[PDB]
Backbone:
C-alpha cells in the first residue's frame, strides 16, 4: 500500500538521523494507525554478534515497564483482588499497622506517598532489606498531596498486586497479563532460548551493557519486549473494547487521570494530556522539575492523549497513542537518547501522517 511507503519516509525523516547524531547501534520504530501496523528497523541488535534489528529483537523497556505494572493493578482491581483504597499491609502482612500502611495503593501507584525518592537507597539490595526499608518508613510530606516520581513507590504497588493474585510478579505478567494482551515475546526474565534475540544496550562510550537485578526491579523497569508486541500493546490501549472484559477493564483503569500537575494528568502509569497537546506540553512532562522534584497535585478532559518515556543505562523507549485519531507510535533504541528527541521525533511523525 502507498501508506506503507508514506510511513517509512516519515520515520526515516525524523527517527533515522537520530542514529547518526547519537551513535545509536540499533533502533525499532513502529506506527499503528486504523488497526494497521508499520514496523521500521535500523542498525544492529548486537555489535559483537553483527545481528540486525528485526521483528524478534528484544529491547529493555525501562520505565515503560510501569505501564504493565499499572495494567496488572487495574486487572486485579476489577477482579476484586484489590481496591485502590486498600493499604499495602492488607496484603503484605509484615507492613500491617506501620506508617507505610497509611498510604493507599493508588497513592503508591501515582507517586504521592510524600516520602519516596526516585530510587531505593543504594544499600537496599536484598528482600529482607526491602522489607526493613518499608517497615522503617515514616511520612514526610502530607500523604496524597505531592507527586515525586519514584521507583520504590510503584514497585511496592506491583509487589502488593502480585500478593493479591497469589503469584510472583514475574508470573503475574508472563502468565496472566502478557497472554491477555496477546503478546508473544515480552518477558520479565528472558529465557535461554530467547537470549539470541535479546539486544545489548550500549552506554555513552559504546560499551555493551545489560540491565542488572535490583530491588523490585521487575515492576519498576525490568520488562523486555519486541516491537510487534509493543504495537499490540498500543493497539490494546487504542481499542480496549475489542478485548475480553477482564483485560478491557484493566486497560480502561490505566487511562483514568487521578490528578494533575500543571498541564500533565497522572493516570495509572500513563501520563495523560488534553489533545491536541502542544509540543512544549509533552516536553514539560520530561522537565527536571516534574521528574526529579516533588510537586503539589491538583484535583481534576474529553479529548486526551497519553505517552510514557522509559530508559535504562543502555536503552531508550517511548510510547504514545492518540485515541481520537486511532494512532500510536513506539520507539525502541539500544542506546539511551535524550527524552526530548524521542518526543519531538514522534510528535513530527504523528502530526504529518494523513488522517
Ligand atoms: B525510568 O526510566 O524513568 C527510570 C528512571 N530513569 C533512569 C535512567 C538512567 O539511569 O538512564 N533514566 N530514567 N528508569 C530506571 O530506574 C532504570 S535505570 C537502570 N539501568 N541499568 C540498571 N542496572 S538500573
Residues:
Amino acid at each position: 500500500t502507498p501508506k506503507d511507503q508514506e510511513i517509512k519516509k516519515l520515520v526515516d525523516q525524523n527517527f533515522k538521523p537520530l542514529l547518526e547524531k547519537y551513535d545509536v547501534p540499533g533502533m525499532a520504530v513502529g506506527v499503528i494507525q486504523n488497526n494497521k501496523k508499520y514496523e521500521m528497523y535500523y542498525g544492529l541488535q548486537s555489535v559483537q554478534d553483527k545481528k540486525a534489528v528485526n521483528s524478534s529483537t528484544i529491547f529493555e523497556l525501562g520505565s515503560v515497564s510501569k505501564l504493565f505494572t499499572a495494567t496488572a493493578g487495574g486487572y486485579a482491581k476489577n477482579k476484586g483482588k484489590i481496591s485502590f483504597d486498600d493499604t499495602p499491609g492488607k496484603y503484605w502482612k509484615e507492613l500491617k499497622n506501620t506508617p507505610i500502611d497509611q498510604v493507599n495503593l493508588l497513592q503508591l501507584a501515582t507517586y504521592t506517598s510524600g516520602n519516596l525518592a526516585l530510587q531505593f537507597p543504594d544499600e537496599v539490595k536484598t528482600d529482607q532489606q526491602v522489607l526493613t526499608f518499608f517497615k522503617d518508613w515514616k511520612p514526610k510530606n502530607s500523604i496524597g498531596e505531592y507527586r515525586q516520581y519514584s521507583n520504590p513507590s510503584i514497585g511496592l504497588f506491583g509487589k502488593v498486586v502480585a500478593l493479591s493474585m497469589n503469584k510472583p510478579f514475574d508470573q503475574v505478567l508472563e502468565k496472566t497479563i502478557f497472554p491477555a494482551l496477546g503478546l508473544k515475546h515480552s518477558y520479565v526474565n528472558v529465557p535461554k532460548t530467547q537470549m539470541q534475540n535479546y539486544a545489548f544496550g550500549y552506554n555513552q562510550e559504546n560499551q555493551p551493557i545489560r540491565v542488572n537485578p535490583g530491588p523490585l526491579d521487575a515492576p519498576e523497569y525490568g520488562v523486555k519486549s519486541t516491537l510487534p508486541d509493543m504495537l499490540s500493546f498500543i493497539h490494546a490501549n487504542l481499542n480496549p473494547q475489542k478485548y475480553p472484559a477482564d483485560i478491557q477493564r484493566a486497560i480502561n483503569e490505566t487511562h483514568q487521570g487521578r490528578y494533575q500537575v500543571n498541564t500533565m494528568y497522572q493516570a495509572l502509569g500513563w501520563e495523560e494530556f488534553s489533545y491536541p497537546a502542544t509540543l512544549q506540553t509533552l516536553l514539560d512532562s520530561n522537565s527536571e522539575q516534574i521528574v526529579m522534584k516533588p510537586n503539589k497535585v491538583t484535583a481534576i478532559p474529553s479529548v486526551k492523549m497519553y505517552h510514557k518515556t522509559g530508559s535504562t543505562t543502555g536503552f531508550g523507549t517511548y510510547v504514545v497513542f492518540i485515541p481520537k485519531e486511532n494512532i500510536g507510535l513506539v520507539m525502541l533504541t539500544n542506546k539511551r537518547i535524550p527524552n526530548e528527541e524521542r518526543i519531538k521525533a514522534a510528535y513530527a511523525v504523528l502530526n504529518a501522517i494523513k488522517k
About this structure: Residues 1-355 form one domain. The chain has one domain: 1-355. The chain is about 35% helix and 20% strand. Residues 62-63, 151, 211-212, 214, 221, 310-313, 336 surround YDB (CB under 6 Å).
